Design a protein around this ligand. Sequence first.
Ligand code: GZL
Length: 296
Amino acid sequence: PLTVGFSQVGSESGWRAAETNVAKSEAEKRGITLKIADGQQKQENQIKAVRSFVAQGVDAIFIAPVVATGWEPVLKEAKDAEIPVFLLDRSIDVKDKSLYMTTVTADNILEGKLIGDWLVKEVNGKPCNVVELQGTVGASVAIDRKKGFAEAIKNAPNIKIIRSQSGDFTRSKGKEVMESFIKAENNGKNICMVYAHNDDMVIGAIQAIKEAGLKPGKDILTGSIDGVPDIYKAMMDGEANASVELTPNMAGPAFDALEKYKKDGTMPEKLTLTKSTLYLPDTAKEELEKKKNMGY
Ligand SMILES: OC[C@@H](O)[C@@H]1O[C@@H](O)C(O)[C@H]1O
């Protein structure tokens, strides 16, 4: 029997809730005992959880690292204990890449690029002021999604990012920050598009846009990432424009790699990429139907 300790970031978004659900169902069908620690969005809580898993002598540790920095000490402890570590859905910045087995993740630069490329085509040379709702400060995915979008719009100077602040990857903070952007930009009239690093923040933004008396999806376009059910519902109501799907099944490939490793010492590739796909309202109904069956 295998026991895996998973240090989870928390439950800040519908996507992460689905990731947790899928981690559980994946573990269950594989006969793996999965212990999930909830970090409540704090790195030090995650480090404490990892230390507990090491002390307990679990067979493997999964970590969704809330931010990219500060993991060397605890990863050295896990390595000294000979407990393999698998990173899910965010990445870390360490010199010693042998401190973990693999990172299962999307290409988050690509995710940002997909939204940026879409926007360039959508506005077709016309002026477009963008407001950006970033993810958690220091999260690899926020850094990368910012970069991908920025690079995609570079040759379209008609597009300008005029506001950018973290919305903590939550609906509530996304709404709060969007409200501040709207008030700072002529009741939202000087805003063409909101780019949110996740769907949840943009769903909060959609509320703020409506409450300001504007039409989300028309007066202010939306581009975001995850493909949570509620973004497709928003698309079907005409209130959201573009979203990049992110599989909630980050745990599956990690379990695959773990099982192979425990069976005969087969090491995984250092980067295990999941597939990213842009979805627009024309496929929203079909994608929404695929979702209650994807962990949501
Ligand atoms: O890999 C994705 C990731 O780490 C992000 O965390 C969640 O907040 C969320 O919705 C999201 O896209």
